[PDB]
């Protein structure tokens, strides 16, 4: 089997991407944030505290003939941005892009933090990191990908995120029309439960490539590119008037600037992030200070290849017995 679904930016900045997901029978379609940095499929639901729901579409298990309470199971998750959610668990039929899993754990939120309530466009998350991070207790649950894997034509999924445009998540196949050149594969460590890999270095603009190992994660659920402070300082030093602002919480730059590209290495291959991808616009409405898309990972404890990086590439998440990542230009 295979599946193919379109993923759509939630706003004009590509802050996140939503993908429609069918849950239950008859289908209830919710727009989920596919997150390769976490391992829970959780949804706004008929159980979510009413004051914490503001425009999201909810999953109502009582209206699904295939829903069953997973008795005694609870979940609770905290993300890198300080957001959180928790609740109880149902099993139900879940389909993405035509690919169906029966008996998927659907984590029903009883509580969500303010950042979720305030984002009306995201109805929940679909985690695609390794199932070792799943938070369900006392019986850990599998991701949608791990439950689909054995049925797939190939044990893979691909992320093809758009810049200010829709893109695609595919399950079970490589679309050889979706990228240019060849795919370069690189090793993955699953020790922390992430798609963790080592970039071979970077360049700023037309500058020389610096060969240096940068360990980080491929995380579709993180907007920005978080790299070591040395690398980030080298990038922003090429933008007149850029500076790190403790008040704003990262590097800002004049909105009048033209940003340089940023290149990262994947083995001997190179992925180029155009400068435009690094512009996240005014820090507040009408400001002439703009927020940068490359930020320091110092204090986060890991480097994160978030959407700024991933949307410059066709990315293969190879879930074979020995996982690997692949990157191609597009
Ligand atoms: Na922000």
From Swiss-Prot:
MF (Gene Ontology): aspartic-type endopeptidase activity
Catalytic activity reported: Hydrolysis of proteins with specificity similar to that of pepsin A, prefers hydrophobic residues at P1 and P1', but does not cleave 14-Ala-|-Leu-15 in the B chain of insulin or Z-Glu-Tyr. Clots milk
Record has Heme as a keyword: no
Keywords: Aspartyl protease, Disulfide bond, Hydrolase, Protease, Signal, Zymogen
Domain Peptidase A1 intervals: 17-328
Active site: 35, 199
Entry's EC annotation: 3.4.23.22
Broad EC category: hydrolase
GO biological process: proteolysis
SS bond partners: 255-290
Family label: Belongs to the peptidase A1 family.
Protein name, entry field: Endothiapepsin
Residues represented out of the complete protein: 90 to 419 of 419
């Amino acid at each position: 089997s295979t599946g193919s679904a379109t993923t759509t930016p939630i706003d004009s900045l590509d802050d996140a991407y939503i993908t429609p997901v069918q849950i239950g029978t008859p289908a209830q379609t919710l727009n989920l944030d596919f997150d390769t940095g976490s391992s829970d499929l959780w949804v706004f639901s008929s159980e979510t505290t009413a004051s914490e729901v503001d425009g999201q579409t909810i999953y109502t298990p009582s209206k699904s003939t295939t829903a069953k309470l997973l008795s005694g199971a609870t979940w609770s998750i905290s993300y890198g941005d300080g957001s959180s959610s928790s609740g109880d668990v149902y099993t139900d039929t879940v389909s993405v892009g035509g690919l169906t899993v029966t008996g998927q754990a659907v984590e029903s939120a009883k509580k969500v933090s303010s950042s979720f309530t305030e984002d009306s466009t995201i109805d929940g998350l679909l985690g695609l990191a390794f199932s070792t991070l799943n938070t369900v207790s006392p019986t850990q649950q599998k991701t949608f990908f791990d439950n689909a894997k054995a049925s797939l034509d190939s044990p893979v999924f691909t992320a093809d995120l758009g810049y200010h445009a829709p893109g695609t998540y595919n399950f079970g196949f490589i679309d050889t029309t979706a990228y240019t050149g060849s795919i370069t594969y690189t090793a993955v460590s699953t020790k922390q439960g992430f798609w963790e890999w080592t970039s071979t270095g970077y360049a700023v603009g037309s500058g020389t490539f610096k060969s240096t190992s940068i360990d980080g994660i491929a995380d579709t659920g993180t907007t920005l590119l978080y790299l070591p402070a040395t690398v980030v300082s080298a990038y922003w030093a090429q933008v007149s008037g850029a500076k790190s602002s403790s008040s704003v919480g990262g590097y800002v730059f004049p909105c009048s600037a033209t940003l340089p590209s940023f290149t990262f290495g994947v083995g001997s291959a190179r992925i180029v992030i155009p400068g435009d991808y690094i512009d996240f616009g005014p820090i507040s409405t009408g400001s002439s200070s703009c927020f940068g898309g490359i930020q320091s990972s110092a204090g986060i404890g890991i480097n994160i290849f978030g959407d700024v990086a991933l949307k410059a590439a066709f990315v293969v998440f190879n879930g074979a017995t020995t996982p690997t990542l692949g990157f191609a230009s597009k």
